Design a protein around this ligand. Structure first.
Ligand SMILES: *[C@@H]1O[C@H](CO)[C@@H](O[C@@H]2O[C@H](CO)[C@@H](O[C@@H]3O[C@H](CO[C@H]4O[C@H](CO)[C@@H](O)[C@H](O)[C@@H]4O)[C@@H](O)[C@H](O[C@H]4O[C@H](CO)[C@@H](O)[C@H](O)[C@@H]4O)[C@@H]3O)[C@H](O)[C@H]2NC(C)=O)[C@H](O)[C@H]1NC(C)=O
Ligand SMILES: *[C@@H]1O[C@H](CO)[C@@H](O[C@@H]2O[C@H](CO)[C@@H](O[C@@H]3O[C@H](CO[C@H]4O[C@H](CO)[C@@H](O)[C@H](O)[C@@H]4O)[C@@H](O)[C@H](O[C@H]4O[C@H](CO)[C@@H](O)[C@H](O)[C@@H]4O)[C@@H]3O)[C@H](O)[C@H]2NC(C)=O)[C@H](O)[C@H]1NC(C)=O
Ligand code: NA
Ligand code: NA
Ligand code: NA
Lengths: 667, 674
């Protein structure tokens, strides 16, 4: 739908990129990438990389040996990570497109496909020549990680059988051929297993968009890499960390509310953890590890891990006990809101915490080991051989209740810091002579709709079938949440011509007992929907803002084949070219109820720095230096806070149509 | 609002019965009951009783002394039980109403308040001449157990100030003068009394009628009383036990469902009980015992009781594993009819399980011990002074979540045994030449309503004030409620027959949004109603109004209103015929604006009468059929597709405010249902 135009030169480059996301598990020896790949000599091309040191390091490490082709790559393990990072450096410091391309061809040919794709996807994102380029949605690149094993197996069965043996029989199982695609209907995990109440939320926690979303978040801004590239953004890194989780968690909490599930559970490393996770997914070697209910974190195997983790926390508790201290070669003062940077970087243990370009093995990650122990897997066999859990991958992390429980813990500690900050005062927040006299919102209505994604990358083909470009294409379809578009009409009385910023937040109305929600202690349950600017004339004004224009969300990724068609028309998708790392639009609202679950909308209008000139979106945010999530980035005091340029509207989220996703999947 | 006529002899006798419930916490030295009590010579009254051994027994315990006034009385403690049973026997064996009344005036004056009330309530229910007389509602007799301590306290203060400091200020604290009487608005409890998700349903479990209902259950057939009075009912006693709890838990699980709460959790005596509760009550000496979340059941104080409890259940397992076994001086087969009765009496440790006319102190009871461990109190100081939990009274038991945990545990055990019963076959259930073609219901709507009762019995009055039988002090609280609706049933019959029409209500979906299958749902249905229709051949339509449902009743009238009705020769006919059933208020679980989905199950079968039971209880179908038939046992769901069966999906809506608190806000006018 929303597109953008592109010259034949961009087209050739884009198709070259996408060729690496096409048949990922296998090698076409006839194909151009293979000829290039097989014999390409990095050493002879040394002067075609910006950074000799990087390439040397790569050749060293590579001649030493990388991970093998049959294993499962995860970034959370040292040696694999380092291999990946070196490969990435290689892609990144390539002189030009051509060399980068030749470098990929090599790596595709010579290396573990998981490692390669991790590296490449990030390089494409992070390279400056490649800004403007497009990467396929992660569920197409790694489809095996966006579906339960039931479906995956059905796919393999159908392929072994070279088609359906009894079409009518297959239809009972949600399998049918549609033109030259085989289509699998896919149920969420709780259609087959309801082990605890968390399964109530599967349509969210398993939603291929939510998971892809987290995968983008990491890809844009990996914990091991410095934010150097982004210049000024670097000094805000910590801020972005906290914001991302605090937002995600708020959105998650909304889902919880509408399923009658309340606040996110706390755990202790010295105690068993009540909430299990039974992953219904596997790998060519092993199944993902399961965590039974009341799994005891404190066993022989974890004793040392727990020590480390306990210390990592106690250390931050000590920071909170002083207000000003020296850590990691910086001098920190918790009265300073800019210290959020340090705090965010502390918890993520990222490159910017130290002054470095990449993290080092001895700089041990709290998140890595939290994930590792929460994951409940047995100890890895060797460095390349471990039992995967959902927290070994960004594609799968959102699937485990424990994920939210972990980041909840971290975020909470970060707000323990936020308490140091002076609450915004009356006269910091006032917009003199402007008043929001009314807010009116359209119908807020959620629903489910079937969605298909191309899952072909999961299918293995034959020597003979590959040269024949024989087609066995696979689509997986499942109900995914969506909502109807809606308008927010804001009526404001500006005394005077002024330029304003309008901000829109969604928040809960009551807690799960009907206690109405007070800002004083519920400010962090506010989810930001929109940020925009408006000319405000004297007298009466009215802004109309449509949920499609909301800046914080994106449209669904277009499939590769569709992107591929658009390229022949000098076209490319807009949203995928620029706006990929945002939350998908359909998920903005939690699942409402047939009778209208109560939330509230917080509209806030405040003075914009004129510019004296015309305005464009991206730099317009950077010109006003308000902290992310303003004015709800720190504790509020209700009475000191409320003001005429604020408005709170009680709203109701309805749901229409079929309420349970499995009803779509009925034979 | 329905009544029954009554003559002057009744009125005068009735008034005499009620007079003893005035200012129960004190003595009016000017009252008639006081003159009668003074005049009554207990040592010279051997001739007032039809059972001289019972009188001798009383006089013996009496010569040594009873529980002193001002201590808490509980049926769950041995000596107090013996004394109370003894008092009751005197009440019961009094030869005459005049002897009964003198004895009651005596105990009213000279014995512990709680003991006396306990036995007097029971005696009235039990005595031949006195049944058919009305009793004040349990919450008007025992306000202390039906009023949370915020309000109870406000009442103390208001009485001490003889009104309000300044009328506007205590309008803000929810206190009102209305017609020369006080009204205090009362909210349901915080998370400082229900410190977990269980709070979502305080409006059910603190509900005064629900609690009354359980107290009435106990009082109609005390565990310590044999069945002799009810003759052939003796055979069906254990069967009631299951039906009462199964049924109650079904009603309770429906509330869970609409509050997103899911299945009542299991527990273990060797582990901590997750789900605590802080009773909002205090006795004369003690605040009630608190049970915090994650309370360790297994500690020194409770070890020996846990040993008891554990074997008590495990021997039931041994009885299941054998199938025939000699136990309690009977030879008992679990394929037998008598089995259901045994099972029930076993779990309740009835007087019937043994020889006993009246239960022997020394026969240790699983329910008694269970309530001590789950109540979490310190061990009693001496045998007249113990530290009360909610599990110490039938008035307060339904308040503690651990109560439903206990009785669900019992009910499951009996369901485990129910595997030994033979599932109903096809022709067994099939009504020949009778089909339900359609069922149709009116809109099912829950909503909230303020409700008043007088709590004066927990408030103290002056020497002077007591002369007027003073009762100023009322509690107004929002209680669940629904609108009347009618079910219409479309029937086609080959023949004229007589049919029983039963209709039940139960759940539609899992917490997972899956349809419940009958093999797993049968225990979750509760009976709404049964009746007998003469059914004509051809097509007919039976209508039934929620007003006429057999299992529910109108609210009790306050004692004031009872008197105002006697003055014109009447009594409230529900308080007369059926004081022991669920209030109709609580018929439906709280709905949603959506409509919450449940199944109404309608069932028609051939009426085959048997000689009327003389009933301790809810008049049930004059049938050889079990209680709660055809849901009295596990089913084979095939056999439940019969033409004389109908499962109809039904949605319960709600109207006006969604939470009771929105009604007790000063200066806020709520959305009331229309
Ligand atoms: C502070 O705390 C102390 C200790 O707990 C309390 O002391 C107790 O006081 C109560 C009275 O309130 C005592 O109980 C009563 O006292 C008499 C006991 O008599 C003793 O001696 C006789 C021989 O003469 C023995 O038979 C007997 O075993 C005793 O050892 C009785 O006369 C009382 O009987 C009266 O009341 C009963 C019901 O209680 C009636 O049935 C009778 O008709 C009669 O009226 C009664 O038994 C108790 O003995 C004291 N405990 C101790 C350890 O000494 C204080 O009361 C308390 N102070 C305050 C302000 O609370
Ligand atoms: C059952 O339980 C419910 C739920 O808890 C109780 O309802 C609460 O009741 C109290 C009244 O007792 C309510 O408190 C009052 O709030 C009013 C609404 O205020 C709004 O506007 C004001 C400015 O006027 C803002 O400050 C505020 O943020 C709101 O935006 C106030 O007008 C009242 O004013 C009083 O304030 C001071 C005390 O600080 C007094 O000295 C004054 O004289 C004046 O009376 C008051 O503060 C509260 O809103 C209710 N809670 C909920 C969740 O709705 C019921 O009271 C309770 N019933 C019983 C019998 O216990
Ligand atoms: Na947590
Ligand atoms: Na005690
Ligand atoms: Na419970």
């Amino acid at each position: 739908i929303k597109t953008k135009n592109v010259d034949a030169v961009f087209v050739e480059k884009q198709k070259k990129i996408l060729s690496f996301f096409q048949d990922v598990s296998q090698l076409n020896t006839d194909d151009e990438y293979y000829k290039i790949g097989k014999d390409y000599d990095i050493e002879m091309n040394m002067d075609n990389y910006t950074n000799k040191k990087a390439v040397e390091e790569f050749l060293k490490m590579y001649r030493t040996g990388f991970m093998p082709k049959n294993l499962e790559f995860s970034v959370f393990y040292d040696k694999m990570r380092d291999e990946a990072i070196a490969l990435f450096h290689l892609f990144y410091y390539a002189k030009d497109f051509e060399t980068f391309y030749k470098t990929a061809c090599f790596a595709r040919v010579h290396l573990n496909q998981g490692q390669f794709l991790y590296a490449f996807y990030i390089a494409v994102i992070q390279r400056s020549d490649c800004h403007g380029f497009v990467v396929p949605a992660p569920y197409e690149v790694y489809p095996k990680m966006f579906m339960n094993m039931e479906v995956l197996q059905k796919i393999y069965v159908t392929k072994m059988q070279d088609g359906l043996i009894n079409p009518e029989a297959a239809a009972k199982y949600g399998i049918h051929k549609e033109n030259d695609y085989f289509v699998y209907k896919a149920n969420y995990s709780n259609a087959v297993l309801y082990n605890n109440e968390e399964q109530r939320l599967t349509y969210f926690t398993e939603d291929i968009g939510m998971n892809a979303y987290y995968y983008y978040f990491h890809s844009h801004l990996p914990f091991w890499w410095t934010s150097e590239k982004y210049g000024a953004l670097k000094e805000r890194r910590g801020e972005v960390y906290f914001y991302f989780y605090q937002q995600l968690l708020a959105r998650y909490y909304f889902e919880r509310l509408t399923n009658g599930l309340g606040k996110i559970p706390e755990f202790s490393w010295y105690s068993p953890i009540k909430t299990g996770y039974y992953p219904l997914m596997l790998t060519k070697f092993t199944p993902f590890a399961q965590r039974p209910d009341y799994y005891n974190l404190h066993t022989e195997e974890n004793y040392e891990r727990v020590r480390f983790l306990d210390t990592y926390e106690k250390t931050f508790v000590q920071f909170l006990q002083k207000d000003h201290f020296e850590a990691f070669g910086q001098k920190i003062d918790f009265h300073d809101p800019k210290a959020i940077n340090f705090v965010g970087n502390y918890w993520q243990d990222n490159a910017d915490l130290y002054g470095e370009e990449v993290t080092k093995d001895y700089q041990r990650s709290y998140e890595v080991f939290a994930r590792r122990v929460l994951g409940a897997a047995p100890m890895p066999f060797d460095k390349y051989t471990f039992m995967p859990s959902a927290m070994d991958f960004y594609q799968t992390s959102l699937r485990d209740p424990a994920f939210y429980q972990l980041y909840n813990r971290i975020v909470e500690y970060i707000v323990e810091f936020k308490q140091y900050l002076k609450p915004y005062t009356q006269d910091k927040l006032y917009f003199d002579g402007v008043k929001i006299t009314d807010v009116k919102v359209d119908k807020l209505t959620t629903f489910f709709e079937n969605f298909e994604f191309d899952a072909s990358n999961s299918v293995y083909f034959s020597k003979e079938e590959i040269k024949n470009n024989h087609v066995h294409d696979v689509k997986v379809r499942q109900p995914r949440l969506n909502h109807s578009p809606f308008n927010v009409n804001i009526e404001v009385d500006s005394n005077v011509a002024s330029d304003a910023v309008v901000k829109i937040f969604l928040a809960p109305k009551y807690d799960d007992n009907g206690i109405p929600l007070t800002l004083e202690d519920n400010w962090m349950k506010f989810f930001e929907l929109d940020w925009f600017t408006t000319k405000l004339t004297a007298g009466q004004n009215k802004i109309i803002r449509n949920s499609n224009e909301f800046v914080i969300f994106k449209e669904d990724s277009v499939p590769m084949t569709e992107i591929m068609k658009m390229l022949d028309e000098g076209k490319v998708p807009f949203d995928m070219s620029e706006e990929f790392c945002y939350m998908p639009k359909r998920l903005m609202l939690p699942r409402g109820t047939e009778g209208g679950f109560p939330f509230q909308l917080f509209v806030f209008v405040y003075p914009f720095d004129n510019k004296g000139k015309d305005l464009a979106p991206f730099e317009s945010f950077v010109l006003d230096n308000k902290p992310l999530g303003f004015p709800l980035d720190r504790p509020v005091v209700d009475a000191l806070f409320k003001v005429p340029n604020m408005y709170f509207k009680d709203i109701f989220i309805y749901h229409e149509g079929e309420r349970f996703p499995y009803k779509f999947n009925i034979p | 609002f329905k009544t029954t006529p009554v003559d002057a002899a009744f009125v005068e006798k009735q008034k005499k019965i009620l007079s003893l419930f005035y200012n129960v916490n004190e003595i009016s030295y000017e009252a008639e009951y006081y003159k009668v009590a003074q005049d009554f010579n207990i040592e010279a009254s051997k001739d007032c009783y039809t059972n001289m051994k019972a009188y001798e027994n009383f006089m013996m315990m009496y010569k040594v002394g009873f529980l002193p006034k001002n201590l808490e009385f509980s049926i769950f403690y041995e000596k107090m039980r013996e004394e109370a049973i003894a008092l009751f026997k005197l009440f019961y064996y009094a030869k005459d109403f005049e002897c009964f009344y003198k004895t009651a005036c005596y105990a009213r004056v000279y014995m512990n308040q709680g003991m006396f009330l306990y036995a007097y309530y029971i005696a009235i229910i039990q005595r031949s001449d006195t049944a058919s007389f009305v009793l004040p509602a349990p919450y008007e007799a025992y306000p202390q157990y039906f009023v949370n301590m915020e309000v109870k306290n406000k009442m103390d203060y208001v009485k001490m100030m003889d009104g309000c400091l300044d009328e506007k200020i205590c309008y803000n604290y929810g206190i009102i003068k209305e017609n020369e009487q006080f009204v205090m608005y009362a909210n349901y409890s915080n998370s400082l009394t229900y410190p977990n998700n269980e709070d979502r349903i305080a409006y059910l479990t603190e509900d005064v009628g629900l609690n009354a209902y359980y107290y009435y259950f106990h009082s109609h057939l005390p565990f310590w009383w044999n069945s002799g009075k009810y003759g052939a009912f003796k055979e069906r006693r254990g069967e009631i036990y299951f039906f009462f709890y199964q049924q109650l838990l079904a009603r309770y699980y429906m509330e869970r469902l609409t509050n997103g709460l899911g299945k009542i959790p299991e527990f273990s005596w060797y582990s901590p009980l997750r789900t605590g509760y802080l009773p909002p009550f205090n006795s004369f000496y003690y605040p009630f015992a608190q049970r915090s979340n994650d309370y360790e059941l297994h500690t020194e104080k409770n070890y020996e009781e846990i040993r008891f409890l554990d074997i008590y259940e495990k021997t039931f397992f041994q009885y299941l594993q054998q199938g025939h076994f000699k136990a309690f001086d009977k030879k008992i087969d679990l394929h037998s009819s008598k089995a259901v009765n045994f099972v029930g009496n076993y779990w309740q440790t009835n007087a019937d399980l043994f020889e006993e006319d009246f239960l022997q102190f020394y026969q240790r009871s699983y329910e008694v011990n269970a309530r001590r461990v789950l109540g979490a109190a310190p061990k009693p100081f001496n045998q007249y002074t113990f530290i009360p939990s909610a599990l110490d009274f039938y008035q307060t038991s339904a308040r503690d979540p651990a109560f439903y945990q206990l009785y669900k545990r019992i009910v499951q055990y009996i369901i485990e045994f129910k595997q030994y019963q033979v599932p109903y076959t096809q022709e067994a259930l099939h009504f020949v030449g009778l089909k339900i073609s359609d069922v149709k219901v009116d809109k099912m709507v829950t909503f909230f309503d303020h409700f008043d009762f007088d709590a004066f019995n927990t408030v103290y009055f002056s020497k002077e004030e007591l002369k007027s039988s003073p009762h100023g002090y009322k509690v107004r609280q929002p209680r669940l409620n629904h609108k009347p609706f009618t079910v219409t049933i479309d029937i086609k019959s080959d023949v004229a027959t007589n049919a029983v029409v039963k209709m039940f209500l139960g759940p539609k979906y899992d917490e997972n949004g899956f349809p419940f299958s009958l093999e797993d749902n049968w225990m979750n249905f509760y009976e709404l109603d049964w009746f007998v229709q003469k059914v004509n051949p051809g097509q007919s339509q039976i209508t039934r109004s929620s007003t006429d449902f057999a299992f529910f009743k109108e609210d009790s009238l306050p004692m004031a209103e009872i008197y105002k009705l006697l003055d014109q020769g009447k009594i409230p006919t529900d308080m007369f015929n059926s004081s022991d059933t669920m209030p109709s208020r609580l018929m439906l679980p709280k709905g949603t604006y959506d409509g919450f989905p449940f199944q109404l199950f309608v069932f028609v079968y051939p009426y085959e009468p048997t000689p009327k039971e003389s009933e301790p209880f809810k008049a049930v179908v004059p049938d050889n059929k079990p209680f709660g038939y055809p849901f009295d046992r596990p089913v084979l769901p095939q056999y439940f597709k019969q033409p004389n069966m109908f499962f109809k999906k039904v949605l319960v809506y709600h109207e006006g405010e969604l939470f009771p608190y929105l009604f007790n806000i000063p200066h806020y006018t709520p959305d009331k249902a229309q």
